[PDB]
C-alpha cells in the first residue's frame, strides 16, 4: 500500500573536487553487494510545511558540499563523480499510528531495491526514502553501502543534513576524508592469531525448520547483577539465553561476534569518514555456555572485547595487508546464522539528535535485513531508563527465548 511519486538525484551546489581517495582494508571487510539500512520516523506537528521537498533538497546540497564521496585499480573505490545522491518521494495510504510499536516485519516498501547488476559504479551509494502517509506522518528510510562508511559515519552525516534544514551550523568536527590513518604498518607485522578472520563454526546437526520469527523486548531490569561493563554483562546473558534456548549438543562450537568501534581505542582523527568497527570474537562449545555460570559467559565475552587493544587492532590491520584479497575473508550472511549470533549497541549512539527543524523522532530502528542470527540493542524513545532486545531467531527457539526474564 505504498506508490512512489519522485525519484531525483542530487548534486551538491558547489565544485567539491572529486579525486577518487583510498579504502581502508577495513572497508573491504564486506561483500561488493550489499547495503546497511535503516529507518527514522516523524509524526506530523501544528506547523506547516512539515518536511518540504525543495527545502530538504536545497539542504541535501548543502550537506553535500561537505560530504561530497555519497554522490560518487585491482582495489575498490568509487571516485567522487558528483553525478547524483538519489533521493525517492513515496505516498502511503496509511496512519503512523496504526504502527503501535514498529516491529520491523518484512514489509520492505519504505526502501527500494537496487541492482549493481547493470554495474558497480553506475549507481551511486546511498538512497534516502521520504514516504509521506495520510496521517502527515513521514518515514525516511536510509540505505548506505558498508564499504563507504559505517553507522558513526553516516548518522554524523544525517545530523549534518538536520542542522544544516535547521538553519543551524555544521555539527562537529568536519568529516575527515583520508583513511591512512587505518593504513597498514611498513613492514607488516602481524603478532596474534586471529579468529575474527578464521571460519565460524558451522556443520552442525541439520536443523529441522528454516523459518523465522522476529521479537521485540523490553528489559526494565537491568538494576541487577548477580555476581565489567553493561554490555558486557548483557550480551553474555543474551548470549547464554540463546545457546541454552537451541538445544544444540554439548561439543558444538558456537561463535560470539561483536562489533566494535576502533575510533577510541586506536588514534583515529576526529571526523573519520568510514569503518573503523573490529570484531570480537569469543568461542566457547554450547554446553560450557549452558552447563557454567553466567560468570563464565560474561568473563569469556569480557575477554573477547578486552583483547582488542592497539597492538591488537594493528596486528589485524597487518594480517589483512598479507592476504591475496580481502573480501573473500568477509563473512556474512551465511555466517549470521546458529550456532553464531551476532549482539551490537545502538543505546550509546546518537540516533535520536537528528532534528531536521521539525522535531525529533517518534522511533528509528532496523528494517529489512539477513534476519536471523542478529541481535540488536537500543534505546527506548519513551525515556523510562528501559533498554530493546530485537531479535530475531527460528520460531522453536523464540519461545524458549523466554528465559532472558529469568534471572
Ligand atoms: O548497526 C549498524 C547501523 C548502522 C547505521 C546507523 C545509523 C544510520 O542512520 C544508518 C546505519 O551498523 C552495523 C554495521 C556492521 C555490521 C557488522 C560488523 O561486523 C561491523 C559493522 C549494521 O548495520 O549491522
Known amino acids: 500500500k505504498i506508490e512512489v511519486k519522485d525519484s531525483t538525484m542530487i548534486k551538491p551546489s558547489a565544485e567539491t573536487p572529486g579525486g577518487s581517495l583510498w579504502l581502508s582494508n577495513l572497508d573491504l571487510l564486506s561483500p561488493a553487494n550489499y547495503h546497511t539500512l535503516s529507518v527514522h520516523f516523524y ?39 558528483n553525478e547524483g545522491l538519489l533521493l525517492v518521494e513515496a505516498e502511503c495510504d496509511g496512519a503512523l499510528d496504526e504502527l503501535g510499536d514498529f516491529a520491523p516485519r518484512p514489509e520492505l516498501n519504505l526502501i527500494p531495491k537496487v541492482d549493481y ?25 536510509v540505505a548506505n553501502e558498508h564499504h563507504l562508511s559505517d553507522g558513526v559515519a553516516a548518522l554524523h552525516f544525517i545530523n549534518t543534513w538536520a542542522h544544516l534544514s535547521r538553519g543551524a551550523p555544521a ?44 521479537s521485540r523486548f523490553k528489559l526494565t531490569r537491568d538494576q541487577l547483577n548477580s555476581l ?64 557454567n555460570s553466567l560468570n563464565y559467559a560474561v568473563r569469556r565475552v569480557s575477554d573477547g572485547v578486552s583483547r582488542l587493544d592497539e597492538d591488537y587492532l594493528r596486528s589485524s590491520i597487518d594480517f589483512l595487508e598479507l592476504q591475496e584479497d580481502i573480501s573473500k575473508l568477509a563473512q ?11 549482539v551490537i549497541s545502538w543505546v550509546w549512539l546518537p540516533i535520536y539528535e537528528p532534528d531536521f527543524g521539525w522535531g525529533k523522532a ?37 519461545e524458549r527465548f523466554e528465559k532472558l526474564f529469568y534471572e
Open 171 to 214: 555539527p562537529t568536527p568536519l568529516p575527515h576524508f583520508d583513511r591512512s590513518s587505518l593504513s597498514a604498518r611498513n613492514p607488516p607485522q602481524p603478532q596474534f592469531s586471529h579468529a575474527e578472520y578464521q571460519p565460524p563454526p558451522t556443520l552442525e546437526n541439520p536443523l529441522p525448520h528454516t523459518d523465522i520469527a522476529h
Open 228 to 291: 565489567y561493563s553493561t554490555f558486557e554483562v548483557l550480551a553474555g546473558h543474551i548470549w547464554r539465553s540463546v545457546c541454552i534456548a537451541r538445544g544444540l549438543p554439548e561439543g558444538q562450537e558456537t561463535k560470539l561476534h561483536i562489533p566494535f568501534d576502533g575510533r577510541g581505542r586506536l588514534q583515529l582523527p576526529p571526523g573519520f569518514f568510514g569503518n573503523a568497527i573490529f570484531f570480537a570474537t569469543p568461542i566457547a562449545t554450547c554446553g560450557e555456555i549452558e552447563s
Open 117 to 141: 547488476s547493470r554495474g558497480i559504479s553506475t549507481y551511486p551509494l546511498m538512497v534516502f526514502q521520504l514516504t509521506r502517509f495520510k496521517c502527515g506522518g513521514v518515514a525516511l528510510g
Open 332 to 342: 556474512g550472511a551465511h555466517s549470521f546464522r546458529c550456532p553464531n549470533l551476532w
Open 362 to 398: 517518534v522511533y528509528m530502528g532496523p528494517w529489512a535485513a539477513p534476519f536471523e542470527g542478529k541481535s540488536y540493542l537500543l534505546p527506548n524513545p519513551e525515556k523510562d531508563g528501559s533498554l530493546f532486545v530485537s531479535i530475531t531467531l527460528h520460531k522453536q527457539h523464540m
Open 43 to 81: 509524526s506530523h506537528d501544528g506547523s506547516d510545511n512539515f518536511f518540504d521537498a525543495a527545502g530538504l533538497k536545497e539542504s541535501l546540497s548543502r550537506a553535500l558540499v561537505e560530504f561530497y564521496p555519497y554522490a560518487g585499480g585491482n582495489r575498490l573505490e568509487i571516485d567522487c563523480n
